[PDB]
Tab-separated table of C-alpha atoms in Angstrom:
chain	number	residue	atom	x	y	z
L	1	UNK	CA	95.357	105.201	99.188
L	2	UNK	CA	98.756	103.727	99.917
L	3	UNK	CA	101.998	103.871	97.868
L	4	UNK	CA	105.396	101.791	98.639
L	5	UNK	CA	108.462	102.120	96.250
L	6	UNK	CA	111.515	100.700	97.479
L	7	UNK	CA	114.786	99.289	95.749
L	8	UNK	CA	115.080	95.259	95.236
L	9	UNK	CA	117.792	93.500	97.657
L	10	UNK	CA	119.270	91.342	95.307
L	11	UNK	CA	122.599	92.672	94.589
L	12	UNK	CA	124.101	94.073	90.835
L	13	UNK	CA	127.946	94.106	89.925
L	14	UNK	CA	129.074	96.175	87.388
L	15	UNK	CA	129.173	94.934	83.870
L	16	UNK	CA	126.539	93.524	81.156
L	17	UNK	CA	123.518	90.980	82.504
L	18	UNK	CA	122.918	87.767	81.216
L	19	UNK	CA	119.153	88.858	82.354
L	20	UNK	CA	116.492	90.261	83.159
L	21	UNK	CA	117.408	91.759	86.628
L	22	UNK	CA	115.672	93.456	89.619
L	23	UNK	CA	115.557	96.610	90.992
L	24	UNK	CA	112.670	98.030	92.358
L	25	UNK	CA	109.345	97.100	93.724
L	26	UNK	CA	106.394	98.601	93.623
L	27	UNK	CA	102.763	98.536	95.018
L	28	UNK	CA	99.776	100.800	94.733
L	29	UNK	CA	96.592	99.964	97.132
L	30	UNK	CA	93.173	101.774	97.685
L	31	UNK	CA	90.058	100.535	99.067
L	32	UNK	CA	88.098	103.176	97.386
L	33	UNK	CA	86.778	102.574	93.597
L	34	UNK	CA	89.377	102.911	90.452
L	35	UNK	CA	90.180	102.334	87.055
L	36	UNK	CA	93.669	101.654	87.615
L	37	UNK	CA	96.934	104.027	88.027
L	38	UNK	CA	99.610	105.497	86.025
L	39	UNK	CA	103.500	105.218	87.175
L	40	UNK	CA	105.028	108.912	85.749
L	41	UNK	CA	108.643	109.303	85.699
L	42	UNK	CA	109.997	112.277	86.987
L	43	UNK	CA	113.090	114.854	86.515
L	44	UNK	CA	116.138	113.009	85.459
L	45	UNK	CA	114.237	109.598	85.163
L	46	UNK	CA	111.906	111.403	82.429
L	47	UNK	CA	112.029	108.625	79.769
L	48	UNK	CA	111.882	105.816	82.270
L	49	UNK	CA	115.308	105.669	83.446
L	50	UNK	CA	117.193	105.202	86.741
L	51	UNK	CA	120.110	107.517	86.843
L	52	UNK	CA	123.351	107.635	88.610
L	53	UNK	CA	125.381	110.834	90.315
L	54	UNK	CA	127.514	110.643	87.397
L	55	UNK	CA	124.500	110.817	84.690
L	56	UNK	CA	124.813	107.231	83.411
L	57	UNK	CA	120.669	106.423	82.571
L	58	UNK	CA	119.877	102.865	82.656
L	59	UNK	CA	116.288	101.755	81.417
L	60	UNK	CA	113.400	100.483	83.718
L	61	UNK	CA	111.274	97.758	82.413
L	62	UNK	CA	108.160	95.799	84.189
L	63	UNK	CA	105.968	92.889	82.707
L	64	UNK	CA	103.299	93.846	85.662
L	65	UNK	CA	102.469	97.453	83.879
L	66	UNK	CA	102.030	98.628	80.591
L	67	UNK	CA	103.865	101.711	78.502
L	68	UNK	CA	102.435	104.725	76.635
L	69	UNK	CA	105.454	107.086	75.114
L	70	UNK	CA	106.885	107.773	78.479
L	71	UNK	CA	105.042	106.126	81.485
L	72	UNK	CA	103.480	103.144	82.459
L	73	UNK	CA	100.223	102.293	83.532
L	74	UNK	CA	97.468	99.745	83.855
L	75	UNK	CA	94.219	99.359	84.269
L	76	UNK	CA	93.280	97.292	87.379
L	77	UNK	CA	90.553	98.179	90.006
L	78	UNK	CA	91.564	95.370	92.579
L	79	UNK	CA	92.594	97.178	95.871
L	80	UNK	CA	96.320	95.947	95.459
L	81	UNK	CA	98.365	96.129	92.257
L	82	UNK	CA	102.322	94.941	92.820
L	83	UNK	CA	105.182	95.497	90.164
L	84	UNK	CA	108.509	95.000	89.849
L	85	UNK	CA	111.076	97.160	87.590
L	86	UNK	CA	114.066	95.382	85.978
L	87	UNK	CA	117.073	95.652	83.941
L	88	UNK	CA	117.295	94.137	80.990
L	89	UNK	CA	119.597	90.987	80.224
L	90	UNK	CA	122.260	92.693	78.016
L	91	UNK	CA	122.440	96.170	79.443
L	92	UNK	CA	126.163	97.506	80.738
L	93	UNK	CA	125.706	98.503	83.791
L	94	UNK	CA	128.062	101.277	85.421
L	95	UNK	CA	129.107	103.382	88.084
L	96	UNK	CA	126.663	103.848	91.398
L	97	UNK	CA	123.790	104.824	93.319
L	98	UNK	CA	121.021	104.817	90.577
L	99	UNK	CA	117.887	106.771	91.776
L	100	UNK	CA	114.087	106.789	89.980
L	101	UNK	CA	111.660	109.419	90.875
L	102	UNK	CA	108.357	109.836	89.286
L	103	UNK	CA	104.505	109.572	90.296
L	104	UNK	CA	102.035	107.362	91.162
L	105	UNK	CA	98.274	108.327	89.959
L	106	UNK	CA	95.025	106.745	90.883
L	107	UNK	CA	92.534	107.550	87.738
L	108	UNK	CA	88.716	106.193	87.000
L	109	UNK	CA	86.605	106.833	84.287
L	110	UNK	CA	90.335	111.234	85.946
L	111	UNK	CA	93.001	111.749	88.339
L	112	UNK	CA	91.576	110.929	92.135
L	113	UNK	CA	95.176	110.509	94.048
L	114	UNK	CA	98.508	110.804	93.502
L	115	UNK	CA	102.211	110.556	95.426
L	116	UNK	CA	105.844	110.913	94.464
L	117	UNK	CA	107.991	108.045	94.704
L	118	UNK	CA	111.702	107.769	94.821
L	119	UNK	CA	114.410	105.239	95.142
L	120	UNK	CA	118.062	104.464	95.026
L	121	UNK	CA	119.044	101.272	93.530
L	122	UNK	CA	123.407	100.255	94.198
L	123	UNK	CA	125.297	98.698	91.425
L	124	UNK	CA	128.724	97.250	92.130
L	125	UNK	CA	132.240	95.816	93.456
O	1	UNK	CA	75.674	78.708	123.028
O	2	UNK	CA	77.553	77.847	119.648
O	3	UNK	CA	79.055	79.479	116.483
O	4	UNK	CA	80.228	78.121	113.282
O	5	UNK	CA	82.417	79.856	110.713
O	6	UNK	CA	83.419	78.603	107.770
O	7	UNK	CA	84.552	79.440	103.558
O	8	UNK	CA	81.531	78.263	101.358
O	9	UNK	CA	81.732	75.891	98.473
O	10	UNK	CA	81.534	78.178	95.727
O	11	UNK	CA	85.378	78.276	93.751
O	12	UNK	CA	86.106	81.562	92.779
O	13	UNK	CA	88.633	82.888	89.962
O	14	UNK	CA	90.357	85.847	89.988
O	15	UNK	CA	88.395	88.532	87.446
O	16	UNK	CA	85.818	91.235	87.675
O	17	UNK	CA	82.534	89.263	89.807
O	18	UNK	CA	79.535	88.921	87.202
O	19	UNK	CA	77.411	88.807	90.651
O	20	UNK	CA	77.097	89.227	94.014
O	21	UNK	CA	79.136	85.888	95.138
O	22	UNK	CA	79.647	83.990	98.172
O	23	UNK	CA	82.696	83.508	100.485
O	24	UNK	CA	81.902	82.909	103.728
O	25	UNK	CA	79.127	81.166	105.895
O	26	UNK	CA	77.996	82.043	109.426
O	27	UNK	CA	76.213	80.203	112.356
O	28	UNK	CA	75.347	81.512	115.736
O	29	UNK	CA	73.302	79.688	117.922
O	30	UNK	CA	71.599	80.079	121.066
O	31	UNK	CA	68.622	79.002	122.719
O	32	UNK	CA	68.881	80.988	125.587
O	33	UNK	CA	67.267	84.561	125.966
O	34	UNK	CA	69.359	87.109	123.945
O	35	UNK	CA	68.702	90.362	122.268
O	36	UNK	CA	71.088	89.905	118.998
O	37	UNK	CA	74.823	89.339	118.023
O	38	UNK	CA	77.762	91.098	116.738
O	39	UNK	CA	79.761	90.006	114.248
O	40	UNK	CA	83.543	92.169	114.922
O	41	UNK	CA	86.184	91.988	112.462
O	42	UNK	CA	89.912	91.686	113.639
O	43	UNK	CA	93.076	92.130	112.478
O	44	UNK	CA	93.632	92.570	109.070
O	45	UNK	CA	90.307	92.121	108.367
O	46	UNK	CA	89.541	95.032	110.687
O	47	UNK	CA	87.276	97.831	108.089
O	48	UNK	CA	85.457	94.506	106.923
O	49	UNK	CA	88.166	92.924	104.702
O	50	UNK	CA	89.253	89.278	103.665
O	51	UNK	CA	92.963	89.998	103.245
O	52	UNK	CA	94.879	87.713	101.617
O	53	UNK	CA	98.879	87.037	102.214
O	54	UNK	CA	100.071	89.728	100.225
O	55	UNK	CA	97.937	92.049	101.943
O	56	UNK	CA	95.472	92.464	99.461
O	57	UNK	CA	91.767	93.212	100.659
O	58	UNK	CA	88.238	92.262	99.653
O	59	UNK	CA	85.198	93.808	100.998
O	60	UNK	CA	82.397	91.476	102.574
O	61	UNK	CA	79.029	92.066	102.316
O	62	UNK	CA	75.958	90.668	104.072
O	63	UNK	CA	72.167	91.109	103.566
O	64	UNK	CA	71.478	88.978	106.888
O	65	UNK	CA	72.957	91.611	109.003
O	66	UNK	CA	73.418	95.239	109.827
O	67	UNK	CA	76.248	97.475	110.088
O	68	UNK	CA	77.522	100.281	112.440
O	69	UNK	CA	80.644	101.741	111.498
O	70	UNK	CA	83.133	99.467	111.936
O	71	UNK	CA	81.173	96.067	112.480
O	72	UNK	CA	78.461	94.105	111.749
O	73	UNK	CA	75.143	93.150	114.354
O	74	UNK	CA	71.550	92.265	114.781
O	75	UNK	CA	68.989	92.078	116.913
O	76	UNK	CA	67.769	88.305	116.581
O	77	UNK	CA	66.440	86.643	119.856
O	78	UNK	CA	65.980	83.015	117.940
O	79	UNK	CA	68.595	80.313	118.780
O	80	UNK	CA	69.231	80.425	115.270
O	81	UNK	CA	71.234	83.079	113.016
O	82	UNK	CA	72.411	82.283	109.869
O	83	UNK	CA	74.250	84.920	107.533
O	84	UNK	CA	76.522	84.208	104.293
O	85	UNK	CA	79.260	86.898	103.648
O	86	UNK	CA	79.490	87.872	100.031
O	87	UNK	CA	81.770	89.393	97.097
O	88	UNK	CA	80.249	92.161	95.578
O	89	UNK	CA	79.663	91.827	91.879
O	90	UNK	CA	81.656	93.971	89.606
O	91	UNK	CA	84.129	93.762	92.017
O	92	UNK	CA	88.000	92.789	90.258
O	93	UNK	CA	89.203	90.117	92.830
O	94	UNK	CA	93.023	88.693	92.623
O	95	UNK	CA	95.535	86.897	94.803
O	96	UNK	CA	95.467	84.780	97.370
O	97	UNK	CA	93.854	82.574	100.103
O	98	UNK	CA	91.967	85.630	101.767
O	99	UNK	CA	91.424	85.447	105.295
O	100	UNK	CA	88.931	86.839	107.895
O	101	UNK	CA	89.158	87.053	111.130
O	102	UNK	CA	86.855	88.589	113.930
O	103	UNK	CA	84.721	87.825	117.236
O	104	UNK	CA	81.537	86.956	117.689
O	105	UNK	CA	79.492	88.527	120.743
O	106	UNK	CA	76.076	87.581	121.975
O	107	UNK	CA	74.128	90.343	123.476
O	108	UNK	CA	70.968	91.049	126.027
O	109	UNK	CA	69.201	93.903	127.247
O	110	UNK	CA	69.621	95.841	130.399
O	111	UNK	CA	75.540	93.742	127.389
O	112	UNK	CA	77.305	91.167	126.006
O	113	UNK	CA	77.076	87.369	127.641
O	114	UNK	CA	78.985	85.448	125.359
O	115	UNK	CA	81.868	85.685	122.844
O	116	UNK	CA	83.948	83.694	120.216
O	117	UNK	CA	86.700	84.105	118.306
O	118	UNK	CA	86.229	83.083	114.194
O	119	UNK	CA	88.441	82.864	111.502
O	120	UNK	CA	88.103	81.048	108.138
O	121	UNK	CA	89.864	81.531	104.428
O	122	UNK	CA	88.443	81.658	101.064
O	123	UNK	CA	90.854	80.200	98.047
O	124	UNK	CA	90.221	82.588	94.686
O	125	UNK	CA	91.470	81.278	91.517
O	126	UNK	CA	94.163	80.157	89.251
């Protein structure tokens, strides 16, 4: 059971997208058998939100993983499952070094793994 | 001495398998006394994988030969072994040209006499 989160290198400039933007990537991989896996946020991203030293929250999104009130997940019982987390085209986006934290969970059926994940995405001039 | 390696015909899409369903085909030949084979993955494959671009892996399976920890072999003193490597059914397979890679060691009692290098990929899906 394997778990890489990392920030996107495409850079972000302050201001309001035209699009749909990147800013993390994720995978989750096990060899071993599994329904699929749940991405939790955690502390200040509770709500699914990247957040900034200043406490500006900017919304994740990914069309790789589903949502349920306040995480996403999917079922998918390949050994590899990749996603990416974007902005949204529209959002303002402000001042500095945006971090997520949350938790990755295997599941069948059940929780069978798990591993925190963190990363700091840059906006800016 | 002679081995052949190669992806079979079968197209496969990207789903949960309905059956147990083929990927690869092997040959080894050899006319000359020998005990068995051994059939060792490498690489990526190494664990008994097909592993596509991104990484992602695939199990193989064989009925043809046995298994001991970390490869596959047989005791077979013919000229002829055949084996096909298979996708277990139920299994949810996804993206990419998978890969395997591995050498091939013939084997006598007394010890291995000859060896080959193989490596073949399998396209799934859409």
């Amino acid at each position: 059971f394997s778990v890489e989160f990392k920030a996107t290198e495409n850079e972000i400039v302050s201001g309001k997208l035209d699009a749909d933007t990147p800013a993390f990537h994720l995978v989750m991989s096990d060899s071993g058998e599994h329904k699929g896996w749940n991405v939790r946020p955690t502390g200040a991203s509770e709500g699914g939100q990247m957040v900034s030293a200043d406490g500006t929250r900017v919304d994740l999104h990914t069309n790789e993983l589903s949502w349920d009130n306040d995480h996403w997940w999917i079922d998918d019982g390949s050994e590899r499952v990749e996603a990416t987390f974007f902005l949204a085209a529209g959002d303002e986006v402000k001042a500095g070094e945006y971090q997520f934290t949350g938790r990755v969970e295997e599941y069948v059926e059940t929780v069978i793994n798990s591993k925190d994940i963190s990363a700091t995405k840059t906006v800016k001039e």
